[PDB]
Amino acid sequence: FPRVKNWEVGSITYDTLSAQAQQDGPCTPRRCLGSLVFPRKLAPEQLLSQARDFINQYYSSIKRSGSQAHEQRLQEVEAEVAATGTYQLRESELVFGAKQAWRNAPRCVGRIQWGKLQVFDARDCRSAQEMFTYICNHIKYATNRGNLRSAITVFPQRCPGRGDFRIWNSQLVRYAGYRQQDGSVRGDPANVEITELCIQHGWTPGNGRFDVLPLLLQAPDEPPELFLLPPELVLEVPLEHPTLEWFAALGLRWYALPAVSNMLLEIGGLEFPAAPFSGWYMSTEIGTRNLCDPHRYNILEDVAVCMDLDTRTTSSLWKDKAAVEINVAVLHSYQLAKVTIVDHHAATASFMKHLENEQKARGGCPADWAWIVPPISGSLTPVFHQEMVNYFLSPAFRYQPDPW
Amino acid sequence: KFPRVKNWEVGSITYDTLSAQAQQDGPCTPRRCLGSLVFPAPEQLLSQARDFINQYYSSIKRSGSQAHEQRLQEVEAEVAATGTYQLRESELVFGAKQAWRNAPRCVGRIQWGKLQVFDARDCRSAQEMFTYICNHIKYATNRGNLRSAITVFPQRCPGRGDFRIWNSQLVRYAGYRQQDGSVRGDPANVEITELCIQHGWTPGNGRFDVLPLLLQAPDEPPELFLLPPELVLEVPLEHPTLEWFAALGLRWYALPAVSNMLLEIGGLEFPAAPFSGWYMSTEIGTRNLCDPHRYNILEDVAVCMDLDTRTTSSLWKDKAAVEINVAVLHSYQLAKVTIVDHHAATASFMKHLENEQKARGGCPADWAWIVPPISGSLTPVFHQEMVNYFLSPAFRYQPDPW
Numbered sequence: 001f002p003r004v005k006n007w008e009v010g011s012i013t014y015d016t017l018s019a020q021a022q023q024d025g026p027c028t029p030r031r032c033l034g035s036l037v038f039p040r041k042l043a044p045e046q047l048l049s050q051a052r053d054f055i056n057q058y059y060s061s062i063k064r065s066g067s068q069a070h071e072q073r074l075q076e077v078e079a080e081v082a083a084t085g086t087y088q089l090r091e092s093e094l095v096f097g098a099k100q101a102w103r104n105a106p107r108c109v110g111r112i113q114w115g116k117l118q119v120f121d122a123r124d125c126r127s128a129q130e131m132f133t134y135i136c137n138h139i140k141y142a143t144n145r146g147n148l149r150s151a152i153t154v155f156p157q158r159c160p161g162r163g164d165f166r167i168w169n170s171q172l173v174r175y176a177g178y179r180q181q182d183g184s185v186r187g188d189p190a191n192v193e194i195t196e197l198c199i200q201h202g203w204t205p206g207n208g209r210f211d212v213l214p215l216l217l218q219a220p221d222e223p224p225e226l227f228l229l230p231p232e233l234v235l236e237v238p239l240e241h242p243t244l245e246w247f248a249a250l251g252l253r254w255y256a257l258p259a260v261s262n263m264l265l266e267i268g269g270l271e272f273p274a275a276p277f278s279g280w281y282m283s284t285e286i287g288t289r290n291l292c293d294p295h296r297y298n299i300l301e302d303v304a305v306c307m308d309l310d311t312r313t314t315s316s317l318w319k320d321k322a323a324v325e326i327n328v329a330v331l332h333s334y335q336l337a338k339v340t341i342v343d344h345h346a347a348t349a350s351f352m353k354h355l356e357n358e359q360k361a362r363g364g365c366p367a368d369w370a371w372i373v374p375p376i377s378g379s380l381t382p383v384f385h386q387e388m389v390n391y392f393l394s395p396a397f398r399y400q401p402d403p404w
Numbered sequence: 405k406f407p408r409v410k411n412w413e414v415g416s417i418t419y420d421t422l423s424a425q426a427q428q429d430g431p432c433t434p435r436r437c438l439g440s441l442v443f444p445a446p447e448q449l450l451s452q453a454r455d456f457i458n459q460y461y462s463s464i465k466r467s468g469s470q471a472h473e474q475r476l477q478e479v480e481a482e483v484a485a486t487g488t489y490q491l492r493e494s495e496l497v498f499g500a501k502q503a504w505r506n507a508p509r510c511v512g513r514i515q516w517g518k519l520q521v522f523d524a525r526d527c528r529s530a531q532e533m534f535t536y537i538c539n540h541i542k543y544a545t546n547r548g549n550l551r552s553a554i555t556v557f558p559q560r561c562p563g564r565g566d567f568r569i570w571n572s573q574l575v576r577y578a579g580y581r582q583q584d585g586s587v588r589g590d591p592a593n594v595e596i597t598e599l600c601i602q603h604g605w606t607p608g609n610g611r612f613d614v615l616p617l618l619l620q621a622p623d624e625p626p627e628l629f630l631l632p633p634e635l636v637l638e639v640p641l642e643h644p645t646l647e648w649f650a651a652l653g654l655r656w657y658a659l660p661a662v663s664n665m666l667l668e669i670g671g672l673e674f675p676a677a678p679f680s681g682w683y684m685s686t687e688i689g690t691r692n693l694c695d696p697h698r699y700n701i702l703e704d705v706a707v708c709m710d711l712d713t714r715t716t717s718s719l720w721k722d723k724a725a726v727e728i729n730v731a732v733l734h735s736y737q738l739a740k741v742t743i744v745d746h747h748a749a750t751a752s753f754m755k756h757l758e759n760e761q762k763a764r765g766g767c768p769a770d771w772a773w774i775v776p777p778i779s780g781s782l783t784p785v786f787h788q789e790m791v792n793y794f795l796s797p798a799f800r801y802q803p804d805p806w
């Protein structure tokens with residue numbers, strides 16, 4: 001039972017939940033690999049023990065462990081697996097499982113919201129055009145004219161033999177990244193590959209640096225087909241600064257909806273390789289990571305030139321002043337456009353309260369410090385001085401190999 | 405089966421073969437990672453001694469030679485005879501630099517080869533210890549052109565108590581509990597301040613009172629020694645364009661000198677071996693001045709800057725924090741005291757990572773301590789995966805002597 005200290009307040013807790021951690025991470029007593037983005041690498045008897053565990057904690061979460069339909073649902077699963085080698089989740093179990101996957105996500109700072117999640121059951125989806133319709137409904141519901149609502153859409157689970165449903169885009173909304181003669185990129189460099197793919201599966205490449213990519217959607221076996229997102233469905237936010245008048249002249253924009261669509265949802269031994277989920281942005285994701293990363297839009301120096309900041313010397317902290325103004329612009333622009341966003345101080349304060357809730361409710365909370373501390377102003381937030389334990393609980397979102 | 409390490413900014417991939425040589429166990433298991441935690445005879449002595457001797461003889465490209473085997477035989481002989489052994493001067497210099505090179509939480513390790521090593525293993529009393537420390541501070545400060553240095557006092561020995569410096573750093577500001585239950589001065593030094601007072605020190609009543617040294621000779625109570633004021637170089641803090649900032653009366657000291665860690669070299673333990681370098685500006689501006697459990701000045705500075713502190717979405721914290729760091733850098737440059745900003749320091753660390761991959765096949769590094777506490781992702785270390793592990797020679801934490 002690890003002792004976990006908050007070095008700002010002095011408080012001590014013990015993480016007992018970590019003892020229930022099953023699937024083993026990348027660290028050993030000899031070397032810590034906590035900072036690696038992708039840890040390590042990516043007889044139906046194990047399915048039945050994973051399913052029992054999931055059922056047991058589903059009934060625990062509704063008081064009803066002991067007697068009654070808890071007893072009864074264990075046999076239904078045993079019977080289902082003995083007869084088919086797999087099983088189906090009840091709608092309510094699927095809702096509970098998607099929420100727990102979010103709640104168990106060690107890299108997510110927005111987990112105070114884990115109980116409010118809309119779950120669209122697309123498990124009877126049997127087509128790519130059907131997929132596209134589900135995804136458009138999701139986007140419509142989650143975007144909600146800028147009053148963003150958390151949502152996940154669960155497509156059919158992997159069955160032994162026969163193919164997987166699969167969204168090839170890493171998020172539902174991505175900007176195109178176009179190479180050229182210099183090998184430099186116009187648009188988002190993080191999306192060079194998926195842009196390449198979209199073109200080589202039919203797409204007419206577009207203008208410049210904020211072109212919404214089409215969706216490559218893969219029904220089982222039948223190959224991926226392109227789908228174009230209607231522009232009125234993709235809500236975007238032009239970036240302006242409240243006092244720097246020229247900032248809008250940079251022509252910067254970002255989209256309103258963060259919707260991860262390449263991760264695998266796993267519940268009770270079942271696997272859902274296409275289960276896109278969405279929330280709302282924390283402002284540093286846009287301002288600091290997407291716009292200021294050197295391997296992304298990399299605008300820091302452009303904004304610094306315009307601010308007349310002394311770029312001749314690192315000790316002027318011109319990078320830091322320009323970054324703060326870019327986050328100010330992001331926050332200002334989303335608020336003006338009435339699009340839900342959260343600054344990193346509000347987000348981290350919410351995560352500390354979530355850490356307190358989880359301590360009482362489950363005896364701990366898996367958290368990945370490197371991902372929970374924001375990428376600017378880290379020690380200014382109350383999560384910097386909080387020791388955290390990282391471990392893997394089920395249900396879970398997991399990385400998976402790309403569908404090529 | 406060596407960890408693959410990626411830099412996400414550039415796409416660099418390497419493998420840390422050096423971690424396979426890790427000489428102790430950390431807190432992590434395959435079940436759970438504890439990487440973020442702040443605090444994670446004769447036959448084992450011999451294998452640590454043998455390993456260190458081997459390292460030393462490789463560094464002087466004399467491995468397996470005659471000198472090498474004589475040393476290995478002289479050490480195990482002397483361990484048999486006395487239960488311990490003595491390092492030669494050159495071995496001590498090599499081991500002290502290696503302990504710096506091996507420190508995973510140090511971003512300043514590009515400098516690890518330029519370390520002045522003072523051999524104080526002949527020290528006899530607390531009064532000699534005090535004289536050695538004052539020459540260390542004088543040499544290291546060098547009128548503001550700071551030089552890295554370590555002073556090594558006698559090793560731990562069976563039959564005698566340890567030399568110990570009770571102060572966690574050689575230069576520290578007193579922290580005084582108050583009527584308000586509050587703290588006047590540095591809240592991090594409340595415990596040491598109360599010890600100084602109860603060993604006779606007549607306290608002050610300011611926010612930047614330099615603490616006396618509590619120096620403990622073997623099998624003695626600690627003895628109190630006052631630092632001559634002309635020995636402790638301080639920097640008054642001003643801002644280049646916020647003129648009211650100088651009126652806050654803020655100061656910091658020139659010399660960061662850690663004095664409470666244990667130096668382990670080839671199984672030998674030096675409980676007293678204070679080392680000093682120079683500050684990176686975020687330690688002063690962000691940690692010491694802005695931490696809420698420290699001088700906690702951030703809101704007052706923001707209020708003086710006429711920032712909207714009613715809501716966090718104005719980013720008043722980030723803005724005030726940046727200008728406080730600007731004032732630290734400008735003030736130290738004005739006072740002609742060595743200081744490095746976190747952009748320059750993280751960039752030189754990347755060059756250290758590269759030097760070390762070539763020389764040793766890796767570099768132990770603690771990401772959460774290498775990434776600066778502001779602007780982390782604006783620095784090149786943010787996107788650099790790192791492998792944390794314990795090599796020896798090492799600087800280790802040790803329990804307080806009281």
Ligand code: HEM
Nearest residue numbers: 102105107108109110113150277278279280281282371397
């Ligand atoms: C509602 C508001 C939400 C906020 C503010 C939020 C915030 C974040 C942030 C900031 C990160 C990564 C840290 C970074 O990139 O800087 C993250 C990662 C993650 N989030 Fe959340 N999130 C939200 C909703 C959700 C939802 C609805 C789910 C799942 C149903 C979710 C699951 C995850 C997962 C699995 C990760 C790790 C993703 C990866 O490793 O690529 N989040 N979240």
Ligand code: HEM
Nearest residue numbers: 504507509510511512515552679680681682684687773799
């Ligand atoms: C010369 C310039 C130096 C710089 C710029 C520097 C910088 C730093 C920084 C920034 C940290 C901790 C992270 C933080 O405070 O944000 C650190 C920790 C450390 N440094 Fe360096 N340092 C220097 C010299 C030295 C020297 C000369 C030694 C030893 C010979 C050393 C050994 C250590 C150790 C052992 C730690 C970890 C301390 C602990 O965990 O309590 N450093 N250093």
Ligand SMILES: Cc1cc(N)nc(CCc2cc(F)cc(CC[C@@H]3CCCN3)c2)c1
Nearest residue numbers: 037258259260277278279280281282285289
């Ligand atoms: C649902 C959601 C909301 C929100 N505000 N942020 C997120 C996280 C988005 C995100 C955050 C991030 F840092 C990186 C990515 C790309 C995929 C990562 C990179 C390597 C491993 N996988 C995506 C999700």
Ligand SMILES: Cc1cc(N)nc(CCc2cc(F)cc(CC[C@@H]3CCCN3)c2)c1
Nearest residue numbers: 007384385386387388440441442691772773
């Ligand atoms: C990078 C980082 C992560 C994290 N979880 N916590 C920190 C704060 C580290 C720290 C920084 C610091 F300056 C002091 C301490 C506490 C030391 C104690 C106090 C009395 C005796 N020893 C701790 C940094």
Ligand SMILES: Cc1cc(N)nc(CCc2cc(F)cc(CC[C@@H]3CCCN3)c2)c1
Nearest residue numbers: 442660661662679680681682683684687691
């Ligand atoms: C030699 C040196 C130079 C420099 N610029 N900075 C340092 C590190 C200073 C420092 C940095 C820091 F974050 C904390 C401390 C206090 C002692 C720590 C707290 C928990 C474990 N031990 C001290 C050393």
Ligand SMILES: C[C@H](O)[C@H](O)[C@H]1CNc2nc(N)[nH]c(=O)c2N1
Nearest residue numbers: 035036037370371786787788789
């Ligand atoms: C090397 C390092 O693990 C990698 O750059 C991680 C660090 N922490 C992060 N934290 C967040 N929130 N987002 C990120 O993309 C990353 N990248």
Ligand SMILES: [Cl-]
Nearest residue numbers: 258285286290
């Ligand atoms: Cl994103």
Ligand SMILES: [Cl-]
Nearest residue numbers: 660687688692
């Ligand atoms: Cl310090």
Ligand SMILES: [Gd]
Nearest residue numbers: 644645646647
């Ligand atoms: Gd001014």
Ligand SMILES: [Zn+2]
Nearest residue numbers: 027032432437
């Ligand atoms: Zn670890």
Ligand SMILES: [Zn+2]
Nearest residue numbers: 288289293781
């Ligand atoms: Zn980044």
Ligand SMILES: [Zn+2]
Nearest residue numbers: 379385691695
């Ligand atoms: Zn701090």
